[PDB]
């Protein structure tokens, strides 16, 4: 009874009010179809509740509460939209995940970690989640908007000098160190996921791939999850690794920022795959691109096999690398210092740093499509 009423209050709890209400809406959704409403039990339960449930539906946060400004992202299971909460006039970025496509495509469990990271990390390096809600169609994640854009954009609009690359690499390293210390492994670190704020400081997003480590600080996942150009060889070979798979992505990141291309870029999907697997022979810095001996050493320090990769022993071996020598910041204050690109913003809905961008079958027997999404509302 002690932990009972504590868990009804507790935001991390599966039996709090939002989850208890999720369970009721879900039950109503899943059952209200004449094909199933034939049943006396389904009918009397719907009779008693449909009127009240319809009333909560509107009393709770809806997609309807937001004016959809523009679409700033598009992923496997949905889109990211630039929105404004009608009542509060407050601007947020809202990520949408299609429930239909999460059932049709088998994967409908990644969002739990994604939500929890953003919701509770309370880290300058992690995009914050304010609200999480749902409807018959989607899963909605309301986040702190990042007007600075992503590092895909920054790279496309600039010739990135080593002074800038020093800063962004350092911010990514500390961001992944914060993710790691929460007992998490990103598995999908890439420029499309590195976002810039009002001040031009880095924050990570797309925590879908993320997995909780063992007591050993390792993960037993016999499936390759991530993006071609940035996947490490050990994760291609996984199809029992540590957090050093994220440092490999940092190597690729630095190489792309300096050279202008990814170090294993190929014509085909399997070509990149084969290039990565032969990194010892496929990786080479082009002559015309003037890369320092310190920048080359660090790309090479991460773009090796996991058994000798920099970071395998901790962040400290990364931090002390000669490449990070500068007259602008320290590992203890980068975020307090002025970023290389400070974004000029015309408005609170300025989306200039971002590029321009399903019907469930009515059942005849109980399916329970809403059940895997009970507890999502935060």
Ligand X SMILES: O=C(NCc1cccc2c1OCCO2)c1ccc(-c2ccncc2)cc1
Report the C-alpha gap between 345 and 213 in whole angstroms: 40
Q: Which of residues 1-20 bind ligand X (CB under 6 A)?
A: none
Q: Which tokens hold the place of 168?
A: 């962004």
Residue 74 is assigned to a ligand binding site: yes
Q: What minimum distance in Å lies between the beta carbon of 90 and ligand X? A: 14
In the three-class reduction of DSSP (H, G, I as helix; E, B as strand; rest coil), residue 52 is classed as helix
Q: Which tokens hold the place of 69?
A: 């400004």
Q: Which x/- pattern, by CB under 6 A, does the window 193-232 give for ligand X?
A: --x---------xx-x------------------------
Supply the residues annotated as catalytic.
188
Residue 75 is assigned to a ligand binding site: yes
**Member of 72, 189, 318, 339 binding ligand X (CB under 6 A):** 72
Give residue 314's region: left, alpha or beta (phi > 0; psi -120 to 50). left
Cβ-based nearer residue to ligand X, 78 or 191: 78
Residue 154 is a binding residue for ligand X (CB under 6 A): no
Cβ-based nearer residue to ligand X, 160 or 205: 205
Cβ-based nearer residue to ligand X, 70 or 220: 70
Residue 208 is assigned to a ligand binding site: no
Distances, alpha carbon 71 to alpha carbons 32, 102, 176, 202, 354, in Å: 33, 21, 27, 21, 9
Residue 80 is assigned to a ligand binding site: yes
Cβ-based nearer residue to ligand X, 195 or 374: 195
Report the C-alpha gap between 208 and 242 in whole angstroms: 17
Cβ-based nearer residue to ligand X, 142 or 374: 142
Contact of 29 with 368, CB cutoff 8 Å: no
Report the C-alpha gap between 13 and 7 in whole angstroms: 5
186 by Cβ neighbours in 10 Å (0-12 / 13-18 / 19+) ranks as buried
Q: Which of residues 262-301 bind ligand X (CB under 6 A)?
A: none
Residue 314 is assigned to a ligand binding site: no
**Member of 78, 200, 226, 311 binding ligand X (CB under 6 A):** 78
Residue nearest to ligand X (CB): 75
Residue 79 is assigned to a ligand binding site: yes
**Member of 146, 194, 295, 310 binding ligand X (CB under 6 A):** 146
Report the C-alpha gap between 55 and 58 in whole angstroms: 6
3-state percent breakdown (helix, strand, coil) of the chain, nearest 5: 40, 15, 45
Residue 139 is a binding residue for ligand X (CB under 6 A): no
Q: Interface with ligand X by CB under 6 A: which range of 9-17, 47-55, 90-98, 265-273?
A: 90-98
**Member of 29, 69, 83, 93 binding ligand X (CB under 6 A):** 93
Q: Which tokens hold the place of 203?
A: 């924050």
**Member of 18, 32, 43, 79 binding ligand X (CB under 6 A):** 79
Residue 95 is assigned to a ligand binding site: yes
Report the C-alpha gap between 228 and 225 in whole angstroms: 9
Q: Which x/- pattern, by CB under 6 A, does the window 119-138 give for ligand X?
A: --------x-----------
**Member of 77, 125, 247, 302 binding ligand X (CB under 6 A):** 77
Q: Which tokens hold the place of 335?
A: 């975020």
Distances, alpha carbon 119 to alpha carbons 67, 83, 143, 210, in Å: 23, 19, 9, 14
Residue 357 is a binding residue for ligand X (CB under 6 A): no
Side-chain-side CA neighbours of 336 within 13 Å: the count stands at 5
**Which residues are at the interface with ligand X (CB under 6 A)?**
72-73, 75-80, 93, 95, 97, 127, 143, 145-146, 195, 205-206, 208
Q: Residues comprising the binding site for ATP? A: 72-80, 95
Q: Residues comprising the binding site? A: 72-80, 95
């Amino acid at each position: 009874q002690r932990k009972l009423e504590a868990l009804i209050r507790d935001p991390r709890s599966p039996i709090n009010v939002e989850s208890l209400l999720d369970g009721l809406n879900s039950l109503v959704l899943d059952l209200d179809f004449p094909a199933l409403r034939k049943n006396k039990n389904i009918d009397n339960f719907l009779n008693r509740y449909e009127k009240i449930v319809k009333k909560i539906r509107g009393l709770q946060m809806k997609a309807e509460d937001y004016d959809v400004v523009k679409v700033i992202g598009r992923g496997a299971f949905g889109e990211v939209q630039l929105v404004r909460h009608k009542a509060s006039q407050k601007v947020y970025a809202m990520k949408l995940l299609s429930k239909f496509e999460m059932i049709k495509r088998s994967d409908s469990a990644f969002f739990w970690e994604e939500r929890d990271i953003m919701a509770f990390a309370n880290s300058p390096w992690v995009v914050q989640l304010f609200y999480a809600f749902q409807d018959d169609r989607y899963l909605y994640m309301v986040m702190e908007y990042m007007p600075g854009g992503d590092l895909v954009n920054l790279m496309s609009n600039y010739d990135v000098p080593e002074k800038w690359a020093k800063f962004y690499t350092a911010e990514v390293v500390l961001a992944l160190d914060a993710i790691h210390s929460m007992g998490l492994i990103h598995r999908d670190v890439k420029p499309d996921n590195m976002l810039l704020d009002k001040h031009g400081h880095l924050k990570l997003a797309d925590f879908g791939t993320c997995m909780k480590m063992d007591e050993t600080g390792m993960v037993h996942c016999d499936t390759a999850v991530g993006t071609p150009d940035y996947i490490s060889p050990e994760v291609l070979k996984s199809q029992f690794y540590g957090r050093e798979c994220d440092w490999w992505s940092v190597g690729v990141f630095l190489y792309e920022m300096l050279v202008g291309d990814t170090p294993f870029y190929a014509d085909s999907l399997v070509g990149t795959y084969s290039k990565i697997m032969d990194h010892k022979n496929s990786l080479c810095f082009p002559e015309d691109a003037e890369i320092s001996k310190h920048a080359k050493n660090l790309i090479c320090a991460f773009l090796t096999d996991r058994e000798v990769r920099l970071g395998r022993n901790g962040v400290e071996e990364i931090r002390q690398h000669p490449f990070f020598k500068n007259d602008q910041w320290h590992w203890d204050n980068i975020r307090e210092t002025a970023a290389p690109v400070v974004p000029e913003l015309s408005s609170d809905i300025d989306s200039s740093n971002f590029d321009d961008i399903e019907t469930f079958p009515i059942p005849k027997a109980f399916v329970g499509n809403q059940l895997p999404f009970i507890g999502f509302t935060y």
